[PDB]
Amino acid sequence: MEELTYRLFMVATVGMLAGTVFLLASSREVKPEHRRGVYISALVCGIAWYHYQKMGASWESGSYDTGLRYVDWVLTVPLMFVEVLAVTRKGAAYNEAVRNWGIAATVMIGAGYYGETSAAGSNEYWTGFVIAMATYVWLMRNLQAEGEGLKGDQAVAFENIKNLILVGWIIYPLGYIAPVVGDFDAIREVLYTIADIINKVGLGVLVLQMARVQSGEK
Ligand SMILES: *C/C=C(C)/C=C/C=C(C)/C=C/C1=C(C)CCCC1(C)C
Ligand SMILES: CCCCCCCC/C=C\CCCCCCCC(=O)O
Ligand SMILES: CCCCCCCC/C=C\CCCCCCCC(=O)O
């Protein structure tokens, strides 16, 4: 598990870079008025690229620092919400939702870090997990409510974005509780790595697909 975790860290490092530069290269395929989301998606992968280089070295040393992961989450998760809420809102409704979902994500990740840096299985470990779960469900319930009246190609493209978050973000609570299911300290970092790749690269690809539809492409 130890060597597999190191290899996945190094592979995800290059995958985040590949996601960053591919998304920058693909921005020419859509109209200029829909390139902002492609650029923000590349920045998300670019930030994760910077932190996955550190996480890979941190894991290789033997003294792993999950703070590198959580500081990447607390920066990138609100950024990923910026373009999701843009599809359905603008003006005051947008700024409110962006602010509120960003506060919720920060509490979720902060509570998770409080619990993950506690003793595994302790009351603090569970306190962080329960608080993070409740804010997570609040975020997912809000997300499902977004884009209710949409129809056509834009609705299907937005539903793919929504379902990627609704399904792909479940990997994180499973990773957090993997250390108390078995001798699976490294499996937690395996699941965190796979989820970041699926959710960061995958969202960027879907946002790119949303920009193609908005550009009138079939
Ligand atoms: C780019 C990184 C991504 C999208 C981060 C997502 C992280 C969360 C959805 C994780 C939340 C957690 C829980 C729901 C319960 C246990 C603690 C956390 C922080 C792992
Ligand atoms: C805690 C420190 C965070 C460091 C973040 C480092 C991430 C930099 C990586 C490359 C970003 C490139 C993404 C492209 C930016 C948008 C494209 C554009 O503006 O035209
Ligand atoms: C229990 C409720 C917690 C409320 C959290 C409030 C805001 C927390 C903000 C984000 C913290 C996550 C980032 C911390 C990791 C860095 C630590 C380190 O590098 O040593």
End-to-end CA distance of the chain: 44
CA distance 190 to 197: 11
**Which residues does 56 contact at the CB level (< 8 Å), separation at least 6?**
6, 9, 10, 13
Supply the range of the domain harboring residue 58: 3-216
Which ligand gives the minimal distance to the CA of 23?
2
User: How far is the C-alpha of 167 from the C-alpha of 148, rounded, in Å?
Assistant: 18
**CA-nearest residue, atom 2 of ligand 3:** 111
Helix axes 171-181, 91-116, angle to 10 degrees: 10
48 lines ligand 2 (CB under 6 A): no
Instruction: Decide: 16 in ligand 1 pocket, CB within 6 A.
Output: no
The resolution in angstroms reads 2.0
Cβ 181 vs Cβ 194: under 8 Å: no
DSSP 217: -
Distance of alpha carbon 210 from alpha carbon 38, whole angstroms: 9
CA of 46 to the centre of ligand 2 (A): 5
- 211 ligand 1 Cβ < 6 A: no
Experimental method: X-ray
- For residue 74, the ligand closest to its alpha carbon is 3
Q: What angle do CA 146, 22, 70 make, to 5 degrees?
A: 60
User: Residue 100 belongs to a domain with what CATH number?
Assistant: 1.20.1070.10
Residue nearest to ligand 2 atom 3, measured at CA: 47
Quote the CA–CA distance of 174 and 5 in Å, as a whole number.
16
User: Which distant-in-sequence residues (6+ apart) come within 8 Å of 132 by Cβ?
Assistant: 108, 109, 111, 112, 115, 173, 176
Which own/partner contact pairs does 97-101 have at CB distance under 8 Å and 24+ positions apart? 97/142, 101/139, 101/142
- For helices 171-181 and 123-145, give the axis angle rounded to 10 degrees: 160
As for the chain, the residues directly before each break of C–N over 2.5 Å are: none
Distance 20 CA to ligand 2 centre (A): 9
Give the start-end residues of each E strand in 49-189.
none
CA separation for the pair 165, 145 (Å, rounded): 13
Q: Is 73 a pocket residue for ligand 1 (Cβ < 6 Å)?
A: yes
Residue with CA nearest ligand 1 atom 7? 172
- Decide: 71 and 113 in contact? Cβ < 8 Å: no
Ligand 1 lined by 158 (C-beta under 6 Å): no
Contact 165, 139 (CB under 8 A): no
C-alpha–C-alpha distance, residues 181 and 105, integer Å: 25
Q: How far is CA 198 from CA 30, 50, 161, 168, 204, in A?
A: 23, 17, 12, 7, 10
Give 169 Cα–ligand 1 centroid separation in angstroms. Answer: 7
Instruction: Say which residue the tokens 């070295």 belong to.
Output: 57
d(CA 102, CA 82): 9
Judge if the beta carbon of residue 97 lies within 6 A of ligand 1: no
- Total domain count for the chain? 1
Distance CA 122, CA 128 (A): 10
